[PDB]
């Protein structure tokens, strides 16, 4: 993952741990092949397994997953109707 | 699955329940592609070890052969020996 | 950070490490751009909430007067009204 | 593992936990396939990570690691230099 | 559990969960045979060490009188003295 | 290590020190057989992700060909599609 995508994910931390909805978005990260199952389940145990602790571990643990981990995984927001958090990593990216 | 697969695993049931940890089979079982993750969540909101493996096993009896030899293959995998052993004789023909 | 700032932090050192969800006050400095990942990670491996908490403050008392802001603008934003109050005053 | 090895490990808790030096044993635990590599790192992570954590969660997970996991687990303790502890599960066990 | 050990457990239940540290303690009610590995396992799910005390506690709550002095004598032998007097009286 | 192979490591050695995830790889390589357990602990024992990672190339570097292709392999074997593409041409041949 390039600088910008990881800053990215760094600034945008505080909307994606209050926002995204993991139990419906692993199927889809899967699909992408961006995690392997363990990981997940490890992601999955992360602090004390709230959504919230998940979806940090997730988003830490994206910026290892590859040059093309950002756009993959916006992709898979959409594929889970989270269409909106989508919505505001994608303005970013481009802008 | 065929009978003789369900019935050994049936007949061995509490001594899998005993000792499976599951975080070590699903993983297997999901790359393989006969487990959910809808599934894999399911077992995971068991508070202990032992009704996860329970939960688990349910949700194998239900399941076809390939997964039958998914789950022994990962339990092979995995050192549990012991427990392969038991349901070797109920592995079932696959293509 | 300035003296006072540092100081200020001192003082209080003690009601914040008691207190504080590192968590949410790390997700803010991370958003803020004052605090790196792998700081973060230093701070999770700590066992305990305090000595996550402690650990965060101290990285917090070797950080520049904007961090002092990141951190003062995560414990007002995140309901720790009286604890932002100690460090109102110390704000460089 | 049978019910009387178990209830030994239990019985032995504070002992163990107080007194089992980890570092040293993994090599003998995979020597015997007792554990796997990846729940060797699980086990190592287990709560703060200290010796005592790290001991208390290995002896937990024994339980599961088949018939011969006390016996095999006694051996270790012997092949790392443990045999004060090992001595005492020892006795225990025959009595 | 008698009438009088439940009693002083909930009069006593928030000093408690305050200072124990449960892992520990449970080693000493494992070893007794008063504590199940899947208890045990019920308990340290639980994120926090209050919570974790919390639900020891809760489980104590539900168990016999032998039970109650395991846990009486964990807390002795693990040095918590006055936390262990609090108790005394309560002993079945 | 063939000097092919250890250029090739020292060449992405950012890439890969930023990426890897060190408890999905040590695990695999102890499986081999080309990874210690006290190199293991001494890698454990590093505070951040990417210290680990560092310890563990630094490690690599200094062994054979057959540990270069067990790490290649875990590397591909557990997703890091980008990062085995860059040790790809520095394979060495084995056996
Ligand atoms: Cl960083
Ligand atoms: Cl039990």
Same mark, same amino acid.
């Given at each position: 993952?390039?600088?910008?995508?990881?800053?990215?994910?760094?600034?945008?931390?505080?909307?994606?741990?209050?926002?995204?909805?993991?139990?419906?978005?692993?199927?889809?990260?899967?699909?992408?092949?961006?995690?392997?199952?363990?990981?997940?389940?490890? /992601?999955?145990?992360?602090?004390?397994?709230?959504?919230?602790?998940?979806?940090?571990? *997730? /988003?830490?643990? *994206?910026?290892?997953?590859?040059?093309?981990?950002?756009?993959?995984?916006?992709?898979?927001?959409?594929?889970?109707?989270?269409?909106?958090?989508?919505?505001?990593?994608?303005?970013?990216?481009?802008? | 699955? @065929?009978?003789?697969?369900?019935?050994?695993?049936?007949?061995?049931?509490? &001594?899998?329940?005993?000792? +499976?940890?599951?975080?070590?089979?699903?993983?297997?079982? +999901?790359?393989? #592609?006969?487990?959910?993750?809808?599934?894999?969540?399911?077992?995971?909101?068991?508070?202990?070890?032992?009704?996860? &493996?329970?939960?688990? +096993?349910?949700?194998?009896?239900?399941? @076809?052969?390939?997964?039958?030899?998914?789950?022994?293959?990962?339990?092979?995998?995995? #050192?549990?020996?012991?427990?392969? &052993?038991?349901?070797?004789? #109920?592995?079932?023909?696959?293509?």
């Amino acid at each position: 993952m390039d600088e910008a995508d990881r800053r990215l994910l760094r600034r945008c931390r505080l909307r994606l741990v209050e926002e995204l909805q993991v139990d419906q978005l692993w199927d889809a990260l899967l699909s992408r092949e961006l995690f392997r199952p363990h990981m997940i389940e490890d /992601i999955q145990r992360a602090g004390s397994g709230s959504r919230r602790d998940q979806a940090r571990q *997730l /988003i830490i643990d *994206l910026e290892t997953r590859g040059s093309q981990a950002l756009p993959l995984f916006i992709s898979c927001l959409e594929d889970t109707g989270q269409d909106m958090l989508a919505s505001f990593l994608r303005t970013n990216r481009q802008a | 699955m @065929d009978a003789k697969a369900r019935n050994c695993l049936l007949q061995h049931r509490e &001594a899998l329940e005993k000792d +499976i940890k599951t975080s070590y089979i699903m993983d297997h079982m +999901i790359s393989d #592609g006969f487990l959910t993750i809808s599934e894999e969540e399911k077992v995971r909101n068991e508070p202990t070890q032992q009704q996860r &493996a329970a939960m688990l +096993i349910k949700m194998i009896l239900k399941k @076809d052969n390939d997964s039958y030899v998914s789950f022994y293959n990962a339990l092979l995998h995995e #050192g549990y020996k012991d427990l392969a &052993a038991l349901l070797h004789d #109920g592995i079932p023909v696959v293509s």
